[PDB]
Design an enzyme around this catalytic site. Structure first.
Site, PDB file in Angstrom:
ATOM      1  N   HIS A   1      -3.028  11.066  -0.519  1.00  0.00           N
ATOM      2  CA  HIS A   1      -2.513  10.951   0.851  1.00  0.00           C
ATOM      3  C   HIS A   1      -1.829  12.257   1.260  1.00  0.00           C
ATOM      4  CE1 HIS A   1      -1.376   7.660   3.979  1.00  0.00           C
ATOM      5  NE2 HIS A   1      -1.108   8.822   4.493  1.00  0.00           N
TER       6      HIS A   1
ATOM      7  N   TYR B   1      -5.744   2.681  15.108  1.00  0.00           N
ATOM      8  CA  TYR B   1      -4.696   2.836  16.104  1.00  0.00           C
ATOM      9  C   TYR B   1      -5.149   2.828  17.525  1.00  0.00           C
ATOM     10  CZ  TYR B   1      -1.865   4.130  12.030  1.00  0.00           C
ATOM     11  OH  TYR B   1      -1.250   4.142  10.809  1.00  0.00           O
TER      12      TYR B   1
ATOM     13  N   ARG C   1       0.839  -1.186   0.000  1.00  0.00           N
ATOM     14  CA  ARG C   1       0.000   0.000   0.000  1.00  0.00           C
ATOM     15  C   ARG C   1       0.848   1.200   0.000  1.00  0.00           C
ATOM     16  NH1 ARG C   1      -3.060   3.284   4.198  1.00  0.00           N
ATOM     17  NH2 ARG C   1      -4.133   4.553   2.651  1.00  0.00           N
TER      18      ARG C   1
ATOM     19  N   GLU D   1      -7.848   8.974   5.015  1.00  0.00           N
ATOM     20  CA  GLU D   1      -8.106   9.788   6.212  1.00  0.00           C
ATOM     21  C   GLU D   1      -8.560  11.202   5.948  1.00  0.00           C
ATOM     22  OE1 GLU D   1      -5.000   9.385   9.196  1.00  0.00           O
ATOM     23  OE2 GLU D   1      -4.973   7.237   8.981  1.00  0.00           O
TER      24      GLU D   1
ATOM     25  N   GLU E   1      -4.230   0.321   7.651  1.00  0.00           N
ATOM     26  CA  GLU E   1      -3.112   0.733   8.559  1.00  0.00           C
ATOM     27  C   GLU E   1      -3.390   0.198   9.925  1.00  0.00           C
ATOM     28  OE1 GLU E   1      -2.487   5.025   8.642  1.00  0.00           O
ATOM     29  OE2 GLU E   1      -2.355   5.088   6.401  1.00  0.00           O
TER      30      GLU E   1
ATOM     31  N   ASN F   1      -8.244   2.333   8.932  1.00  0.00           N
ATOM     32  CA  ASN F   1      -6.974   2.655   9.589  1.00  0.00           C
ATOM     33  C   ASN F   1      -7.301   2.664  11.103  1.00  0.00           C
ATOM     34  OD1 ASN F   1      -5.930   2.859   7.039  1.00  0.00           O
ATOM     35  ND2 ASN F   1      -5.447   4.999   7.210  1.00  0.00           N
TER      36      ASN F   1
END
Ligand code: NA
Length: 440
Positions: free
Chosen positions: A118, A292, A74, A163, A349, A290
């Site tokens: 991005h 986290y 990616r 994002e 991610e 994504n």
């Protein structure tokens, strides 16, 4: 114990974070060139001017991916390399670079998962209000068209945006990412124009494609939990969940913007006609998550919008910059699978930053990052058990790189980058991933 035999196993990067070569081969100026060269915006004085030198050194990056036994990569294409003026002619030398990189990847048995946007908006566009302008949506879709025309014979899996919450809210509301504006209204406008650009680009891509494509968008999602069951804290959790998650998920799902958040934002909310919402909801083939961290929210009536702050939990481990909560990956996936229409799903991610160093033996002993991967992979097995249609996993990042406003100082790689010599070395967590994937 085992993932699907056809599961996608990869690592992830973004152009400005790794490439360098910022003026080479016709590349134009991006908002992140402008922002990183503004004194004080980056913590440590660094920029993306060199970064990992992956413009020149993507072969080394391929070497790492091969050594790790991955089957996918990616990465993003820099709009500044393709359309240097943002709206204007193409730069064929930019397209040819990515064509060679695509061919090198395929030759190595690594499937390219390309992100179109991005965060590296061409600066000429920003000079005309950037994502504060509807025109930037239109020209984003033009860019998406050109790239797919040239590379869509080889690349099937594409993501429009990465994002958008960050691009809108960190770039235009909180000022911490490029371009660095600080107004709620401009953030929310930007969010709309991003979503519109997405939807315009999807349609443009399908028309330009020389073969059917699997088109997605990539969202950061933060599972949010109220710190108590009080009406104040639950409402705070809802507001934060709407600010990050539902603001994007709902329009994409064809449900409009969430009305609770429209009411909350008031006159800061964007002008959103039915025609735009229809375009935003262009059918997708997959959605990228994504993941986290969680947010455990307490009401914060004196804070900025959304008036919700994190309640720290000293019994959870922390990394260099985040709190670790692997269960949140199961929670958010179960919610997507049951509550929203997107399928299949990819983890585009997941990873962590630590104070990594090369030890006396020459390895990087990043056990906490190994543990991070093992714990999140276990939650993905739980999500798969529940029926979630998960098709792949990409570690953030393949290698240490320019981590936005943190600069080169914040190391997310599964491979260590020496930023002085540009030598890369696999960390112990990378070897773990290698051996785990080989076992699968
Ligand atoms: Na710690």
């Amino acid at each position: 114990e085992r993932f699907p035999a056809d599961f996608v196993w990869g690592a992830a990067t973004a152009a400005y974070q790794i490439e360098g070569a910022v003026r080479e081969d016709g590349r134009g100026v991006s908002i992140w060139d402008t922002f990183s060269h503004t004194p004080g915006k980056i913590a440590d004085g660094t920029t993306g001017d060199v970064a990992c030198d992956s413009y020149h050194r993507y072969g080394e990056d391929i070497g790492l991916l091969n050594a790790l036994g991955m089957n996918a990569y990616r990465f993003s294409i820099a709009w500044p390399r393709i359309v240097p003026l943002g709206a204007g002619p193409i730069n064929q030398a930019g397209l040819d670079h990515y064509s060679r990189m695509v061919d090198a990847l395929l030759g190595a048995g690594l499937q390219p998962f390309v992100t179109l946007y991005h965060w590296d908006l061409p600066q000429p566009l920003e000079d005309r209000l950037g994502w504060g302008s509807r025109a930037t949506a239109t020209v984003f879709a033009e860019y998406a068209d050109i790239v797919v025309r040239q590379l869509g014979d080889r690349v099937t899996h594409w993501a429009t945006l990465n994002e958008p919450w960050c691009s809108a809210m960190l770039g235009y509301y909180l000022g911490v990412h490029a371009p660095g504006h600080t107004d709620l209204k401009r953030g929310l406008e930007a969010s709309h124009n991003l979503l519109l650009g997405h939807g315009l680009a999807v349609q443009a891509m399908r028309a330009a494609a020389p073969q059917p494509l699997q088109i997605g968008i990539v969202l950061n999602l933060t599972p949010t939990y109220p710190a108590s069951d009080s009406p104040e804290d639950v409402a705070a959790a809802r507001r934060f969940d709407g600010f990050v998650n539902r603001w994007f998920l709902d329009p994409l799902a064809g449900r409009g913007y969430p009305q609770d958040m429209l009411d909350y934002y008031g006159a800061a909310a964007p002008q959103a006609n039915p025609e735009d919402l229809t375009q935003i909801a262009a059918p997708l083939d997959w959605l990228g998550v994504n993941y986290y961290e969680r947010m455990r929210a307490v009401d914060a009536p004196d804070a900025s919008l959304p008036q919700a702050q994190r309640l720290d939990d000293p019994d959870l481990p922390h990394t260099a910059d985040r709190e670790v909560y692997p269960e949140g990956l199961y929670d958010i996936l179960l919610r997507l699978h049951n509550d929203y229409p997107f399928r299949p799903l990819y983890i585009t991610e997941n990873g962590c930053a630590l104070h990594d160093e090369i030890a006396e033996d020459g390895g990087i002993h990043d056990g906490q990052r190994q543990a991070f991967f093992e714990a999140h992979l276990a939650q993905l097995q739980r999500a798969l058990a529940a029926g979630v249609p998960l098709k792949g996993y990409f570690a953030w990042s393949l290698l240490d790189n320019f981590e936005w406003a943190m600069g080169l100082s914040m190391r997310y790689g599964i491979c260590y980058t020496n930023f002085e010599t540009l030598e890369r070395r696999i960390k112990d967590s990378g070897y773990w991933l290698r051996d785990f994937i080989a076992g699968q």
